[PDB]
Write a protein that binds this ligand. Sequence first.
Ligand SMILES: [Zn+2]
Lengths: 52, 200, 121, 82, 50, 104, 118
Amino acid sequence: PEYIRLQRRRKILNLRLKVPPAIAQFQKTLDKNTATQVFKLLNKYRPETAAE
Amino acid sequence: GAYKYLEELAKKKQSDVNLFLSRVRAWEYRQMNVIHRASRPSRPDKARRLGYKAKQGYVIYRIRVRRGGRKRPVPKGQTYGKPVHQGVNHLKYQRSARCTAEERVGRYCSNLRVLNSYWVNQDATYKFFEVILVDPSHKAIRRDPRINWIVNPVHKHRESRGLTSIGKKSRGIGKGHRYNNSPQHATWLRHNTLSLRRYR
Amino acid sequence: ALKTFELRKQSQENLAEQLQELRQELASLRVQKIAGGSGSKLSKIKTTRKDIARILTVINESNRLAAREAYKNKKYIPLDLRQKKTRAIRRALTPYEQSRKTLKQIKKERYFPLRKYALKA
Amino acid sequence: TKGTQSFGMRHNKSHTICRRCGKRSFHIQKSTCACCGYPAAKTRSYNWGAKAKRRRTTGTGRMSYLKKVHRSFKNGFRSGKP
Amino acid sequence: PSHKSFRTKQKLAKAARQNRPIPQWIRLRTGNTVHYNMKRRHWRRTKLNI
Amino acid sequence: AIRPAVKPPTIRYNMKVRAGRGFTLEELKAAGVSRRVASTIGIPVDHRRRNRSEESLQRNVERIKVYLAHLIVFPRKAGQPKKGDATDVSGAEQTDVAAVLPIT
Amino acid sequence: KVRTSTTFRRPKTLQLSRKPKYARKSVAHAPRLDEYKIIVNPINSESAMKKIEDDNTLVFHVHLKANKFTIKEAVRKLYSVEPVKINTLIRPNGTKKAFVKLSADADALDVANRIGFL
RNA sequence: CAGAAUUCCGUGAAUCAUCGAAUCUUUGAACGCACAUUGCGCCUUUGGGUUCUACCAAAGGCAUGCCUGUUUGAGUGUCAUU
RNA sequence: GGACAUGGGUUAGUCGAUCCUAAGAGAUAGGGAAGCUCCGUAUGAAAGUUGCACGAUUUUUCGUGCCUCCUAUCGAAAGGG
RNA sequence: UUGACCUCAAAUCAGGUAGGACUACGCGCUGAACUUAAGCAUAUCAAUAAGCGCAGGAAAAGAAAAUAACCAUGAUUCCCUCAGUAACGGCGAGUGAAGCGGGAAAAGCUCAAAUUUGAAAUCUGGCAACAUUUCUUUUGUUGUCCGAGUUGUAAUUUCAA
Ligand SMILES: [Zn+2]
């Protein structure tokens, strides 16, 4: 279908072409262990729910 | 906030980041339909300053419009008149492509009221616009005093009557000597009506 | 001629049987008109038609009253039971929606309302 | 040949009764009424012909519902029992 | 042509009914000028045009 | 409503005096009237106009002072005269502002 | 997710039925054309008399929208006679005429006498 | 013209006036598909004739575009525990 | 008298229409056109009606699953039937 | 495997909305020619007739990116005047406004751009209850739940500040 083709050829297009550095900087991401540690810290500080 | 950063960054349309984003988004829009619903605005700061709010009842539609002038729709260039009216190829539509985009989106969503629109992208063949529309039948709109005016029947198809921002720009509505023509028909009637007073 | 103040008193099923009896009486009157009519029965044909109309009106009024009672205190009501003003009036803003104001507006009218004043020469 | 004898072969209808306006102006082959424009979702009208607009318009028929609205407006579209 | 649609036959029935004499008691009404009219249609003089 | 006295522009009409749209913010401040209360008591406010001359400023504040002196303000709460209101509203009647403050 | 066909087709959805929160019409209409609107009047012309006295058939003035089933049911419940065949005619005046043949165990003459046009 | 005299000290005549309740045939923006055809269909419920599936009848429904929300889904689009 | 007036008269499972398709017409997807509207008919569409016992007392059309080049209609009272 | 998010679908899903007609007046698009110039092409007729789209009881415009050059005025609209003037025009035929001044009526305002950040304080819908009615036909409130919304709903602010 068209939407499946669009969302697949989009990723193909980003793989092609020279991406400017201000956009390419988001392709670098924290590894698994640091992300796990970060989210463990986040889970101890969460906004109150409706009941709270 | 980040809206000021978005506004300042949107001016730098010749930058590498903007050029890359414009190219990839123009390709995506070309792949999509001529008129298609946009789940979220691609320029939130532009939508906000034009009146869009992130609440139920506000709709964003993206439409592409063909570029260029308006060729005279005559069969073979035959106008059957004086040579002054024989031009076929260098004529310009008096309404903007933004006006045409609002009119077509309004017809596509005849249950809604066209609030505003803004340019988002362009290429050689098409100009891309996002049109902000408001649902007059939604309770969130009918209970908001800041948008309650558009529910009144006097605002039906204001984009077709030229009551939008680009519509009034095309009509030449303004203050001063540069807009002496004013509303054209009203001014023409005022200047061409012969007032025959009762001399008694 | 049947009287509405007793037709309304009479029950729905009894009204249905009375309607059927009126219909067969009207059929008997009409075949009489075909195969030899008399002025009295021709005049009574109109009265029978009016009586049928009255019974149908009473039955319909009772049914609509029952529907209104069933749909009382409900958000959505049948369209025939809803408002019967103009289409523009139905689509117009309610007085509550028109009167809705912002907090800033409410404060402005609360603190600086129009005053009653007069001038002395 | 072009006259009297030619008129003797005219036995094939080109128009029939229109289902919207009732006139014998519904073109059979084009499936379009020359009077009202049926089945297009708009009544055929032109400003160069004002007598045709005079012939068919509001007030030339029954106005069954418009009379009721006019009567109801005088009392303000009130409901309930008297 | 003995091959007629329902709509055509109903129109023929309406036309035949309209082409009937007007009773005299109708013309006898006070202040009425309904005595005679040219709306009488004959099958050979004026055609129905479907 | 009470109107200020202004000088028409151009040399053809600068020798005359006519009625203006509304009193300026500086004139209201000099007369001790808030801009949010001037509209309530019927004093028009013109934010566009400015006082370039002391003569125009004093002329307009004099008009406001005369208007205030001759003004009777009904209390919002009946029988409870608040600050700036009046309790002699029995004899109040509709009078023309032109007679009180003609454009001279 | 093995696809053995080179085409994509829309999957199947639940397609829930309508459960309205209010009835669009408050009161259901009464049955139109029950018996009395179907049967208008009998016909007692010379040809109709011959049909009754010879072919054991009654002649009626049934409604334009009545068919040979509704006419048969209306005759059964109005005159307590079982038709065997029904012929339908549309007269040049625009009204429908019905020839209703009764069974051999019922005489159309007495039925017509009971109806009251003889 | 007659009839209406179950009437006229009475909820009662009248092509009376007014009007806040209803009825409102087939169509028509016309809306199941069509229509030079009163043509061809589908869904739910209730009844008839032996027909839990066929036939007949009645009642209620089935157009398109768009908005909000709901449900069921698709995606070698992005991810986590398993 | 094919005129005028008053009445009467056309009865179908088997005759035609209705069904099918031809030349063609024409929605829908989509694309133009300021627009009235133009092109377009599996067309660049997630275009499903159909094939199969998995539950099922016990001798059966009711909810899944996996599925494969189907498809709007109108258009002949001399074509087919 | 499941779930979450994003995007895209389907349902005779729950509730709604649009079409059409009326066009005297109103807001736009498109758009002639007859005619005048004693011919005729620019011009004129005319930014008109015809065609198309869209409203209301009025519409539109409207609170200056406005005039002016003054001792300055001060939202919009309409009337008188400016004025057949400045100006435009094979400078031919013809066309042709605006500031000021007088009068009618006068009414001002709302958002985006700010960190509520010690608390999304915001809104729709379902359900239930309680009120209300031009009205058993209308219009709300409260409670709870689910959604919208942090890719921003609320509040003080809109430059006069
Ligand atoms: Zn027609």
